Design a protein around this ligand. Structure first.
Ligand code: ADE
Ligand code: ADE
Ligand code: ADE
Ligand code: CYT
Ligand code: CYT
Lengths: 520, 520, 105, 105
């Protein structure tokens, strides 16, 4: 971008526009970027520490920061989310426009015990988008540091670091190291700005609806089937019990025994825990009772895991130990905070098609019955994909992620990001940004030793992201009224999704998207 | 319409189409029309009867029936109403298309004690629209007999009758008598059909919103005014009480005493009654405590009367004796039915601008204060229009009326129909319909006496009304979520706005339109 | 200019054959059971109760005036025209309102 | 693929709904608002026709020996398969699948 100390390089574009089948969100925020690692790349790992084998790692931390808008509230105000979710069966991102501007680099000089800041007019900030995905993709891990939900909040840019192969806390020859400078980047003084655009690949619309039928209630409740099933293996009060083979035809009084076309979704059972502590076992079972996967001798909690309904009817007090997305309140501490400082999602709407998360998928025969041997069956707790299965993916939330990069593998299977959202082969590129090192005064005599004395600085500016979203309109012939997300009409001390008397914006609950209904 | 015994003259067009700024409702129903008054026009009145002076009348009943779609649920399904009200700040009718067809005239012959019906193929039904408004306008009095809310219900056509001037139970020379035949009408046999279209005049969009500010809270809560008001007429702890004139400037701590630009709406006070009977007086006060107007020595209850808020904050248990629209449940008896068989509307949203219906409008000076004479004031219970007043009209309901004819008078004042809806100078014309008399066998010898022997018959067919409605879209920058009409998510024995196990459609509550919000 | 009388009145606009779908509070007590007891009883608009039917319209404005008879014997024995008159007050000066608001005689 | 067998279709042949239109019996002489509940008893009859085009995958087999083929039974009996009996009742005496020709894997 071209021109002045004295001249803004961008305006403030923060707004929504609804246009029939499209909605265009624009959001702009003011950021702050410190100097990280003192302009150094450090090797990092779990060495010392005392970490268990399931926590070892090797990687590198970087002098760079990055931009992250991978959360719905970076784009949708609460009211817009409401508009979205109460009138559409779905939506997807189509295109994006990104803007960095009004940059201002500042130097900090400290004497005492006391601190002066001034402008350093001839200083630059550097930027690039990793558009060929040459860097480890660190979005889609649900990190904090995204654009804040509230447009008036200033935010600090997160620091980029990444991991590679590790054997315990050591590295392997196959471990990759990346230097960000080695990339062409744009260098901006206070006059300049950065822009780029991006188009999203074609992706299925996110399902913003619950079903109003369930897999097991698809039949016509008036008519028999023409199909028969073995109903009894003994009579039938003719005294007493005699071996028999008796067959019945499908009938509305026996909807549990009717032949059908479809199976419910996959299942990886999880441990059921109550919100009233008195119901639970008196031990610490989370790691030990947890559903985990085992990768190169390292255990990892499956969380949130397969899309599964959180609880069956009437049991809203239970939840899978690690099968629901959980947001912290703005009072929550980092670790071992209490139940009332968190917000647990509920994915109950999918119980029309998806197994409940804390129960068996079902039952299977396990032997050959005969006069000598009694029929046996077993419980199935982990069921992979079977032809004929159908299921609903995890819901998204106003404060959850939007997308993730599908790993570059030979094989995926339904690569919808398990934490919720859109899987993208070629996702929105990472956007990296750094303050250029500015040497302090060198000595009078040459020295070859790497320069280690710098003027202390940081930068600030605005960033703007515009996304176009396509909508799937609702076409429902449903006669009665829908469940609709609504704010509460009763009176209170504070308004939901507002700032308080100290100016702290709060999000008092998660909001999903499943209010409108479809048939199956 | 042209053609066959064997040939339908219309199809079934029942559907909604949403199109950005327009929504087009089509509804079609199946009707039944008996022979009324045996093809006679009768003079009718309150003579004998024992009626009080406030109930006397004179008029005429007619052999004709009529069509009435003047209720929102004749056009909007519950789900559509929901769509309407949760996304628009307003709406109005623009144009209409009406269709009578598939007519079938039948003769009834009874011997015994037992009854045979057959087709009378060569019989006609007659129809016309009173498009020059030459007939007494009987729509907009909230009569029953409109198209039913539920498309599968068959309905009987109401009978047309009208009133004229009466002096007690007698007539005056100025009294008008109308013969409907004297009008050209279309004569339809089983093959034929009737159609006409109509355009609505320009009218203000109905306000489907509550305000989120009130008249008395329009100021900037941070800043003083530059304006002053007399604050004290005595000091001010300098002992003891001394005459003084002390002036203060408008201030956020004194929002009740700040000069302002606007006044709240008009007021005609009504008697406050509680839903818990124990609160009320032990008498029958409705006529005797009622707000009434007096017209030519005849009293009439003002009901619903001036648009006024039903109750102030926290007092949802009170309601004006005759200032709220009240719908009957499908269990309600015609007279003296209990509280739980009715549904009382609530117009509480308008308390931002409109006086509460059971309180004074305010207080007025009534004398000249002096050292000798103490300042007096009086309560104002009935306040007409004052320059600077602003107000909100009564809300409409999914089951309330749509429009009424503005009377043809020299003078109206804000002629919005007090029961709610659109006032129309030139409203949708009345549509009249009758089975043509079919003589029974005459005698063999002439007789001049009016024929009085007829073949018994009635007719049935379909009717279709299509209305185009223009929408006022919402443009709100409100950050937090709105109150939205929503059905209840908790489980129950029946679904709202559905048929039961005997196939009776029920409407379990009124729904207004005021959910979205505006600023004032 | 309206050179016509109406042949209907504001309070007689309804269809005299059909009920309304609208209800109004009819009684605040029953109803012979023996005594008087607090109650809330609602009735629907009906041709037998045209004085209690909901309606859309109100009659015109009103500024009441003193009724006087053409047969003198009916009237009060005093001179009440200025003193019983409907007057407006303008800058401390009274003026008889005459003929005043359009009202039926 | 529908587990009971057949073709799964995103956008399958639409449901086709049909009903006899209500035909009121004689109404009363005086208006009543209550649900109309008296009807002339009726029913209907007619023909319906469905035509479907099916594409075939022809067999291209180099298999030298003869195939298993669905065949009716040559031995004599009291009734013919897939026929009506002496009371005119059509019967289907067995299921027939479709897997007779063979492929290599
Ligand atoms: N959300 C998603 N993104 C990309 N591919 C998918 N395949 C199934 N769901 C998907
Ligand atoms: N609803 C309405 N119809 C016609 N004129 C009006 N003037 C004010 N409100 C009106
Ligand atoms: N029968 C079938 N119909 C539709 N999709 C299928 N995919 C695999 N088998 C199928
Ligand atoms: N990836 C998938 C496999 C099967 N079905 C899907 O919808 N998606
Ligand atoms: N009729 C009216 C008079 C004054 N203001 C209005 O909005 N309408």
């Amino acid at each position: 971008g071209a021109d002045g100390v004295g001249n803004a390089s961008g305006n403030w574009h923060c707004d929504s526009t609804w246009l029939g089948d499209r909605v265009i969100t624009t959001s702009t925020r003011t950021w702050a970027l410190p100097t990280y690692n003192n302009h150094l790349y450090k090797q990092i790992s779990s060495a010392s520490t005392g970490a268990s084998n399931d926590n070892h790692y090797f990687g590198y931390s970087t002098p760079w920061g990055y931009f992250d808008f991978n959360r719905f509230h970076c784009h949708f105000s609460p009211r817009d989310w409401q508009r979205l979710i109460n009138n559409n069966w779905g939506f997807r991102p189509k295109r994006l426009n990104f803007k960095l501007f009004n940059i201002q680099v500042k130097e900090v000089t400290t004497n005492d015990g006391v601190t002066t800041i001034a402008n350093n007019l001839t200083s630059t900030v550097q930027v690039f988008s990793d558009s060929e995905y040459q860097l480890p993709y660190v979005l889609g891990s649900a990190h904090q540091g995204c654009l804040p939900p509230f447009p008036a909040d200033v935010f600090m840019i997160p620091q980029y670091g990444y991991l590679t192969l590790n054997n315990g806390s050591q590295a392997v020859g196959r471990s990759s190291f990346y230097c960000l400078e080695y990339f062409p980047s744009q260098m901006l003084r206070t006059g300049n700005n950065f822009t780029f655009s991006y188009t999203f690949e074609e992706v299925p619309f996110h399902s913003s609806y619950a079903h109003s039928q369930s897999l097991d209630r698809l039949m016509n409740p008036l008519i028999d089937q023409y199909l028969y099933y073995l109903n009894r293996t003994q009579n039938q009060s003719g005294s007493a019990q005699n071996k028999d083979l008796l067959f019945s035809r499908g009938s509305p009084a026996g909807m549990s025994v009717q032949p059908k076309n479809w199976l419910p979704g996959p299942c990886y059972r999880q441990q059921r825990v109550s919100k009233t502590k008195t119901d639970n076992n008196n031990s610490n079972f989370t790691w030990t009772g947890a559903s985990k996967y085992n990768l190169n001798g390292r255990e990892s909690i499956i969380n949130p895991g397969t899309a599964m309904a959180s609880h069956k009817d009437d049991e809203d007090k239970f939840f899978p130990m690690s099968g629901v997305m959980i947001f912290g309140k703005e009072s929550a501490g980092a670790s071992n905070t209490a139940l009332d400082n968190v917000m647990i999602t509920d994915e109950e709407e999918i119980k029309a098609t998806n197994p409940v998360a804390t129960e068996r998928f079902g039952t299977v025969a396990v032997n050959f019955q005969s006069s000598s041997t009694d029929p046996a069956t077993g419980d199935v707790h982990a069921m992979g994909a079977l032809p004929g299965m159908v299921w609903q993916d995890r819901d998204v939330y106003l404060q959850g992620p939007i997308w993730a990069k599908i790993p570059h593998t030979d094989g995926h299977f339904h690569p919808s990001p398990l934490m919720g959202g859109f899987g993208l082969k070629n996702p929105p590129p990472q956007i990296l940004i750094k303050n250029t090192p500015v040497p302090a005064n060198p000595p009078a005599e040459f020295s070859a030793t790497k320069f280690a004395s710098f003027i202390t600085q940081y930068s600030t500016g605005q960033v703007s992201v515009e996304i176009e979203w396509e909508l799937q309109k609702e076409n429902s012939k449903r006669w009665n009224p829908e469940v609709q997300y609504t704010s509460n009409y009763a009176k209170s001390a504070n308004v939901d999704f507002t700032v308080d008397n100290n100016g702290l914006y709060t999000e008092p609950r998660p909001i999903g998207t499943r209010y409108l209904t479809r048939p199956l």
